[PDB]
Amino acid sequence: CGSSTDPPVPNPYNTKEISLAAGLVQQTYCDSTENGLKIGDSELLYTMGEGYARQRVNIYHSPSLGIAVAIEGTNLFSLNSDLHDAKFWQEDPNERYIQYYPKGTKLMHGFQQAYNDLMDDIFTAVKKYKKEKNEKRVTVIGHSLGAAVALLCAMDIELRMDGGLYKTYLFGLPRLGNCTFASFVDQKIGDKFHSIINGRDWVPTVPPRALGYQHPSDYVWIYPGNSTSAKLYPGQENVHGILTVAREFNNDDHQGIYFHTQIGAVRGECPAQVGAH
Ligand SMILES: *[C@@H]1O[C@H](CO)[C@@H](O[C@@H]2O[C@H](CO)[C@@H](O)[C@H](O)[C@H]2NC(C)=O)[C@H](O)[C@H]1NC(C)=O
Numbered sequence: 253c254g255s256s257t258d259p260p261v262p263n264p265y266n267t268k269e270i271s272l273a274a275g276l277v278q279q280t281y282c283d284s285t286e287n288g289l290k291i292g293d294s295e296l297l298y299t300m301g302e303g304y305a306r307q308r309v310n311i312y313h314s315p316s317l318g319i320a321v322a323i324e325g326t327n328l329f330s331l332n333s334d335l336h337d338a339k340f341w342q343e344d345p346n347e348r349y350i351q352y353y354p355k356g357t358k359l360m361h362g363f364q365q366a367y368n369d370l371m372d373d374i375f376t377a378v379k380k381y382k383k384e385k386n387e388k389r390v391t392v393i394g395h396s397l398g399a400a401v402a403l404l405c406a407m408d409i410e411l412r413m414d415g416g417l418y419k420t421y422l423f424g425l426p427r428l429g430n431c432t433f434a435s436f437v438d439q440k441i442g443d444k445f446h447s448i449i450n451g452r453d454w455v456p457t458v459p460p461r462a463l464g465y466q467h468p469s470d471y472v473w474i475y476p477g478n479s480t481s482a483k484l485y486p487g488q489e490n491v492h493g494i495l496t497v498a499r500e501f502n503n504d505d506h507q508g509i510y511f512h513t514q515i516g517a518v519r520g521e522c523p524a525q526v527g528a529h
Pocket residue numbers: 451476477478503504505507508509514515516517519520
């Protein structure tokens with residue numbers, strides 16, 4: 253697999269949508285049982301899971317994003333653990349959807365397993381609220397471990413759900429699949445894929461490329477962290493991007509401010525506060 257040498261370009265992404273999506277996923281770190289909670293322009297419709305065993309998933313309706321699915325990213329397992337452990341092994345796509353993927357696709361076991369525990373509930377709830385809200389757009393959002401799950405979900409929606417995917421917004425995204433997977437993401441949802449990295453965050457560097465993992469094309473890197481200075485680094489694994497500035501192995505920037513919305517996670521803002529910073 254290659255590494256892009258394209259020079260960085262200005263950030264072209266909608267920063268109001270990023271700010272909104274950041275709040276929608278921060279809220280999944282919070283108790284989300286309140287009827288009709290409003291986050292930004294969006295209304296909370298449904299919540300699944302909790303934090304242990306399975307990631308919390310919130311479903312919203314948004315005038316700008318449509319039916320928005322947001323996936324919590326708590327430490328079900330740790331990404332700073334022994335990399336020989338089975339969590340990090342590459343494996344085939346699950347039988348539910350393997351027929352849609354090109355030969356040779358591989359995914360990280362720990363992330364695929366987490367998505368597989370959620371996918372049938374997500375599909376059932378999304379279809380229900382698309383019908384009830386007369387909404388064709390589906391947006392998938394995730395942070396941290398949840399961003400890798402959300403990337404798999406976004407592909408699953410594009411491949412298997414009638415109407416496909418509208419957009420995906422991914423914060424502090426770990427690597428998820430191999431070279432073949434990464435290029436299939438570009439092919440299927442490249443124009444819909446938004447990966448946002450804050451500051452010195454280390455999570456987008458794991459699992460390592462030495463284990464066969466590869467990011468899809470493009471990310472927007474906020475630097476310095478929590479600022480509004482950001483550029484787009486085109487192509488897969490752009491050599492001019494985050495490794496030019498030493499990563500910090502704590503969660504500070506990872507749980508930082510993304511275009512005025514904090515994703516502080518379990519010790520963040522509950523309820524989430526779109527645009528408050
Ligand atoms: C960006 O903002 C985040 C908060 O969203 C900062 O994270 C905090 O960092 C301090 C250490 O300086 C920790 O004690 C806090 O626990 C962190 N908060 C959270 C929610 O994790 C981060 O330091 C900021 N980064 C920069 C470069 O200013």
